[PDB]
């Protein structure tokens, strides 16, 4: 009864956003200097790096839990297969707005099953 | 052409327009 | 100077199927790691990423004629807007 | 329509059909003795390996004359083909 | 005989028949499905280019039998008017379209045999295409079981050789598809 | 026309063009910079290394058309001039004083160069691998985090940093600056 | 001396005669048979390949002694006959039937033997691929087995099978081999 | 060519059992040291049972390359 | 103006003038050493081959200048030789050729082993601070937990700074031209 | 000067010299140990092949000067007799079955040359074979130490070339190898 | 051969160093501790690392220009 | 042959053996171990492998 | 056809339309 | 040919149509 | 040929139509 | 068109404007 | 011929049709 | 030759029609 | 065209402007 | 063009300056 | 010649038939 | 133009100053 | 000549038969 | 300028001084 | 000879035979 | 200039002395 | 000479027979 | 200067000598 | 030269024979 | 020399011997 | 200058001779 | 030159001998 | 110099000496 | 020079004897 | 020269002797 522990992928959907915006504004400061400290520039990556990180009974209940993935994958699949092969004609830009929201949207339809 | 799956090919974008 | 994230960017839109699916799997393998702490789960990832990348290949060969017409016209247009005319 | 990409999906259709087999016994090899390992608590990695060896071999073994006879089947149509292209 | 202009033309021709042969009959079509195949087996020097040219000209030489019968009875001893003929039948019609000047029957070889050497080197890739196909799925199939084996340090390349060697053997290849090629090019 | 040694000099020179444009202009800059950002990427052939080379060949061509312009002669200068420009000169210094501020020389200008652009590429390249350095480690560590720890970051952070790449179309924005580093983009 | 037109025509022959030769005899399966196991042994060009075509044609100038002294002292037939009897006929009598619609032409022989013989150049090959293969995989398992997932086996099976090659004498029982299969008869 | 086949086969089979003994004997000392480094001890393993089956090893592959030698003297 | 056989030597000498310049003066060290270094920096082709063996190829013709202006000079470039061969090796030689005056086909292949020798020895010293950096990164990745991570694709952003801060390929090319130098 | 059969003789020769090394002359047996050695250390392209092919010839050129010297029926009698020493005679009696039509003679110069090639080749191999047992034998303990430590994705050829680089130097290497190749090859 | 021998102690010596205060620190929130406890050692020795490592390039490449 | 034979397992011995003692005297704690002990036994590696290779050269001067 | 289609292609829409 | 089914082939398609 | 479900078979569908 | 999708694609930004 | 076997060869789909 | 075999050869196929 | 958004392509920032 | 944005378009700099 | 073998050799099913 | 920030472009130290 | 084996060495099965 | 700055370059620097 | 133990060589069966 | 201490840039060492 | 033993070399089975 | 281990350049020893 | 040996070496065959 | 030792060197043989 | 700091340097060595 | 040493150098066998 | 410091550079040994 | 101590260059062994 | 440490580089043997 333990199996809901989910929660923490909920919590850590934040990153997506944050390591975009900021590994972005690394890349985007150095490509429009190619010249800085050296050093600032490391420490700078550094604090960015931490923002961002902040009887054989038992086989049958695996089986179970087995089973239960196979069936969440399946209807996933079946009920999510539209929204990838339209995201073929995406643009690139939003693309990854569309690959978050799969992941939630996946994420949510696990619930245990 | 529904809304969902919000994205479209080009056919459909003009089938709206 | 925009050629090489044009042709990044038809890449990854083309691939983003395949990609996504893959990615997905094999983080839906990890959830089953986590949830079978002493189990080797490489080995199954590479299979399973095997089998389902051919799959959605597979399945997927009915999106690409088109991009063929598409890529006339905007590769027309394209090196059309290359010189000063 | 397009004999081009009625062969391409022929082909992909043949690769999903020869690979089904051993990559399913592979992984549900890997899988099964996954979860024994995590039951009764080993913690070594041979032991799949060596019976995800066996039984591709085997499975490999079985399978060689259906695998050449279709092989053989598609390589004739495509001198068919050929013939009249 | 050839008094003193037509020995000038003939030694002419016969000085340029190298580049005729290679960019104006079959000669191209065998060479690049040659080529292709064994490009396609995995090896990269195992049979020599001078045997595949060779058997390429020599069924090239049979192709161009008749046409060279009717050449050799008019002009050395109307040969033009079959050649041009055959480029026709052996052409594609919008290549020579293009190739005819402006302003929306195909002539002027000057013209038309550009058209018909890259309908020949069209006609030929897809050959070639055709022919991989049962090979890379040969390679496929290794790869995805090398990968189910666990074993991803190795590449695929040691062990195709030997099963692509044997699917064309059973196959018997290279008679079937060179029967293959003559029934195309001879029908009648 | 090339009467009789000048046909010599320009078949030579002509047949010497490779060599002299991978060690003299500034294709070594572009192609190790695309090379190491292709790297930096985690994948080994996302572009086609050959699409690459020619991109940078593209841009050197381009860098050098002023030159080649201005020669109309003058052009050994012009070519000597911006040799100088974009070099440090106590290693040319150095060279010359091997050899044997009043004037250098191409034979100990040209490894000069061609050292300075190596050292100054592998500075660029070594600014732009770590972002893509600190993708892969919250891969990593947000793996550790949630307890599996059997898994590879390496194949789910690679979709990663294509994405964002793309996105935010990194190619173009780096072809730019660079050639606007180098010169001023009409 | 000689005549005036047989002088062209030998003169003509000559300038062919490589190509003849690279199309027209043993030389083809010597040749292949050599490069395939040169590439089954995993080195890139390390037999240094002037010195493989050099034993192959070594071997083929003695595989055709007797027909070259035949046509020394009307050889043609004899060399038809060669050719008859090591090719497959199928194909001859297709080639045959390209023509306007047991005479065997000798145009409509070479294609044919050749052919043949690389197609059986190429079932040797195989049948060579098979312990080198076989030596691969198996280091190959016991690395990864060990617990390696690193340390490709193509950098340890080299000399493996170097040394079953050695074993085996490679090289001259091969040639021993094929060379029986072709002449002693 | 139903000599090709049974080549495969041979093989396949030859590829196996020789894979068999030291895959199968390190699968052996992993468990049994699993069941209460195991890298060196599995190490010792395999390079004492190689050590022991060189000869065997060499004598089979000598045999089967003898055997293919055969099948293409007068294939 | 070289009529009879000052012609015939001229163009015999031209046409192995690239072999004996790899074989027989100091641009294989060079080379060895760039493409040495190129390896260990972790780079499969960044630095094209082109570029390595221009710049040694020019080293090596600044290291040949004082050769070409002797030029008699057989006898300067038979003192370079022995300067810079092992004697040992070309007395052997010598010994196996025959049955002081050190035979010029005696030396060429000592001074081309010496020369393979010492480009290795110096190899394995630039490689010992990249393979020290490499496994400290290692081993602190493996400390973290991150067994799985690779240690490749992090590793090669530091040893390129400290390849920068070494200042690199100038203090490298500085340090074979002055042993190479000086008399 | 010279007769004009001689000179078409001597012209021949001399325009079959890269073929008649490449047959064999000792040079086969140290190219194939320097490429195989350069292969062993983990490099590719780094030794210059051409350097080693040079260094090759060179000792190849050493070891038959005492035949050029004896040459000038002499010379070919020499070269018989040096190729008798360093060849297989079973190899060398089997060619000369296959060429006439066993016996004792002294031999047949175009039955005892690939005799000789092949003996040589398999030596080679031999010598390969007993080069690369060090460097594998490091590559396996790196490998080993690697493991042990626990990384997992850490490739030991990465770490492994100074380590043979350093042993190789140690050992002397390529002055020692070379005597010992010009050892088996000299006589005394 | 001792400088072949001094460069060999001198790079296992300088492993050692480099590896024994982050190990000593963290092996002698589950994870968050432990990560930014041998973030910031490593951190603070990181300019220490540096020069160390400059300094024995400096030194080779100083004996490489001798000999 | 019979020096094939030797050498391959002599090549077997050196690799136990080198794998014996490393291994046989805390991730950690088994780093700086390892570490000391190639320290220590660096000088005797290195003299077994010279010796090996000696032997080697020996053989193949014999031919 | 279905309005939510498993999968869109051109003739799909072709004949939707 | 049910329509909620896999790929549906072209000619599937064009059978339904 | 009652339903593959997985695959297409062009004979099979031939065989139905 | 809509205004708050996820997609914008240049011809519904054309469209929109 | 079995309907329901693992391997369906052209020649058993010809046998049964 | 018997019709519960897992693979059967083509001469299998072959003897059983 | 809100600003509550992405890297929004010139013609955004240029019809805002 | 609100300076607390994310990306800095340098058209959009010079529209605030 | 069990008919309940693994496998079968191609001579095992000629002789067997 | 808050030059404090990681975006800050030459445009804005220029103007800055 | 046991049958509890994999395949066998022809001489093995011909013996057996 | 600023002395505590999360960012500097050469231009920050040469204009304090 | 034995029979219990394993794979032996040709020399074993032809020994044995 | 401070007591940084990260690493001191050439021109603050220059500064400094 | 031992008849049972975990390796049999070919000059143990030659002395043997 | 510092005199310690905060960064030890050679112009920081050239100083201090 | 002992049978009990784990190894055996050609010579010491030939010696024990 | 002892005689029970593991693989022993061909001097150590022929001393024994 | 520290004499025990540890860590080598040949300036700092010539400098304490 | 004691023995039991699990290596013996070709030198210390010699003397030992 | 130090005597109980471990390996250090030629020059220090040469110094001691 | 000490005799206790870790390995040591051959510099210090031939100063020791 | 101990014989009871296992660095014992050839002069050592040497000397020893």
């Given at each position: 009864?333990?199996?809901?522990?989910?929660?923490?992928?909920?919590?850590?959907?934040?990153?997506?956003?944050?390591?975009?915006?900021?590994?972005?504004?690394?890349?985007?400061?150095?490509?429009?200097?190619?010249?800085?400290?050296?050093?600032?520039?490391?420490?700078?990556?550094?604090?960015?790096?931490?923002?961002?990180?902040?009887?054989?009974?038992?086989?049958?209940?695996?089986?179970?839990?087995?089973?239960?993935?196979?069936?969440?994958?399946?209807?996933?699949?079946?009920n999510?297969?539209?929204?990838?092969?339209?995201?073929?004609?995406?643009?690139?830009?939003?693309?990854?707005?569309?690959?978050?929201?799969?992941?939630?949207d996946?994420?949510?339809?696990?619930?245990?099953? | 052409?529904?809304?969902?799956?919000?994205?479209?090919?080009?056919?459909?974008?003009?089938?709206?327009? | 100077?925009?050629?090489?994230?044009?042709?990044?960017?038809?890449?990854?839109?083309?691939?983003?199927?395949?990609?996504?699916?893959?990615?997905?799997?094999?983080?839906?393998?990890?959830?089953?790691?986590?949830?079978?702490?002493?189990?080797?789960?490489?080995?199954?990832?590479?299979?399973?990423?095997?089998?389902?990348?051919?799959?959605?290949?597979?399945?997927?060969?009915?999106?690409?004629?088109?991009?063929?017409?598409?890529?006339?016209?905007?590769?027309?247009?394209?090196?059309?807007?290359?010189?000063?005319? | 329509?397009?004999?081009?990409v009625?062969?391409?999906?022929?082909?992909?259709?043949?690769?999903?059909?020869?690979?089904?087999?051993?990559?399913?016994?592979?992984?549900?090899?890997?899988?099964?003795?996954?979860?024994?390992?995590?039951?009764?608590?080993?913690?070594e990695?041979?032991?799949?390996?060596?019976?995800?060896?066996?039984?591709?071999?085997?499975?490999?073994?079985?399978?060689?004359?259906?695998?050449?006879?279709?092989?053989?089947?598609?390589?004739?149509?495509?001198?068919?083909?050929?013939?009249?292209? | 005989?050839?008094?003193?202009?037509?020995?000038?033309?003939?030694?002419?021709?016969?000085?340029?028949?190298?580049?005729?042969?290679?960019?104006g009959?079959?000669?191209?079509?065998?060479?690049?499905?040659?080529?292709?195949?064994?490009?396609?087996?995995?090896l990269?020097?195992?049979?020599?280019?001078?045997?595949?040219?060779?058997?390429?000209?020599?069924?090239?030489?049979?192709?161009?039998?008749?046409?060279?019968?009717?050449?050799?009875?008019?002009?050395?001893?109307?040969?033009?008017?079959?050649?041009?003929?055959?480029?026709?039948?052996?052409?594609?019609?919008?290549?020579?379209?293009?190739?005819?000047?402006?302003?929306?029957?195909?002539?002027?070889?000057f013209?038309?045999?550009?058209?018909?050497?890259?309908?020949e080197?069209?006609?030929?890739?897809?050959?070639?295409?055709?022919?991989?196909?049962?090979?890379?799925?040969?390679?496929?199939?290794?790869?995805?079981?090398?990968?189910?084996?666990?074993?991803?340090?190795?590449?695929?390349?040691?062990?195709?050789?030997?099963?692509?060697?044997?699917?064309?053997v059973?196959?018997?290849?290279w008679?079937?598809?060179?029967?293959?090629?003559?029934?195309?090019?001879?029908?009648?």
């Amino acid at each position: 009864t333990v199996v809901i522990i989910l929660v923490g992928t909920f919590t850590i959907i934040s990153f997506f956003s944050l390591s975009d915006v900021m590994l972005l504004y690394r890349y985007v400061i150095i490509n429009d200097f190619e010249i800085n400290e050296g050093k600032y520039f490391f420490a700078v990556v550094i604090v960015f790096f931490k923002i961002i990180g902040f009887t054989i009974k038992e086989f049958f209940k695996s089986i179970l839990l087995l089973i239960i993935l196979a069936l969440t994958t399946y209807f996933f699949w079946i009920n999510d297969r539209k929204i990838i092969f339209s995201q073929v004609f995406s643009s690139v830009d939003g693309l990854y707005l569309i690959w978050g929201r799969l992941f939630k949207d996946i994420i949510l339809f696990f619930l245990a099953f | 052409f529904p809304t969902d799956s919000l994205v479209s090919s080009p056919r459909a974008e003009k089938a709206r327009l | 100077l925009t050629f090489l994230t044009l042709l990044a960017s038809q890449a990854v839109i083309l691939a983003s199927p395949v990609m996504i699916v893959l990615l997905l799997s094999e983080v839906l393998l990890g959830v089953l790691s986590r949830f079978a702490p002493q189990m080797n789960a490489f080995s199954v990832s590479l299979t399973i990423k095997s089998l389902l990348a051919i799959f959605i290949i597979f399945i997927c060969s009915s999106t690409i004629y088109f991009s063929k017409v598409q890529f006339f016209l905007g590769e027309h247009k394209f090196f059309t807007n290359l010189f000063v005319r | 329509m397009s004999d081009i990409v009625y062969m391409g999906n022929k082909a992909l259709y043949l690769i999903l059909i020869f690979s089904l087999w051993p990559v399913g016994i592979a992984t549900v090899i890997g899988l099964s003795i996954g979860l024994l390992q995590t039951v009764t608590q080993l913690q070594e990695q041979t032991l799949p390996f060596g019976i995800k060896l066996i039984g591709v071999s085997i499975s490999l073994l079985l399978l060689s004359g259906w695998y050449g006879e279709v092989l053989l089947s598609f390589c004739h149509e495509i001198m068919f083909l050929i013939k009249s292209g | 005989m050839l008094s003193d202009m037509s020995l000038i033309a003939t030694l002419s021709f016969f000085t340029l028949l190298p580049f005729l042969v290679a960019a104006g009959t079959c000669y191209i079509k065998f060479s690049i499905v040659f080529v292709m195949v064994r490009n396609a087996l995995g090896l990269q020097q195992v049979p020599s280019n001078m045997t595949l040219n060779g058997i390429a000209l020599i069924m090239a030489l049979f192709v161009m039998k008749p046409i060279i019968e009717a050449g050799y009875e008019n002009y050395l001893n109307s040969g033009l008017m079959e050649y041009k003929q055959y480029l026709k039948k052996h052409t594609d019609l919008e290549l020579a379209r293009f190739f005819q000047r402006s302003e929306e029957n195909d002539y002027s070889l000057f013209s038309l045999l550009p058209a018909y050497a890259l309908s020949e080197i069209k006609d030929a890739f897809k050959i070639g295409f055709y022919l991989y196909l049962p090979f890379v799925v040969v390679d496929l199939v290794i790869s995805s079981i090398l990968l189910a084996l666990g074993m991803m340090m190795m590449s695929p390349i040691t062990i195709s050789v030997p099963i692509k060697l044997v699917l064309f053997v059973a196959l018997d290849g290279w008679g079937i598809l060179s029967k293959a090629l003559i029934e195309q090019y001879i029908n009648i």
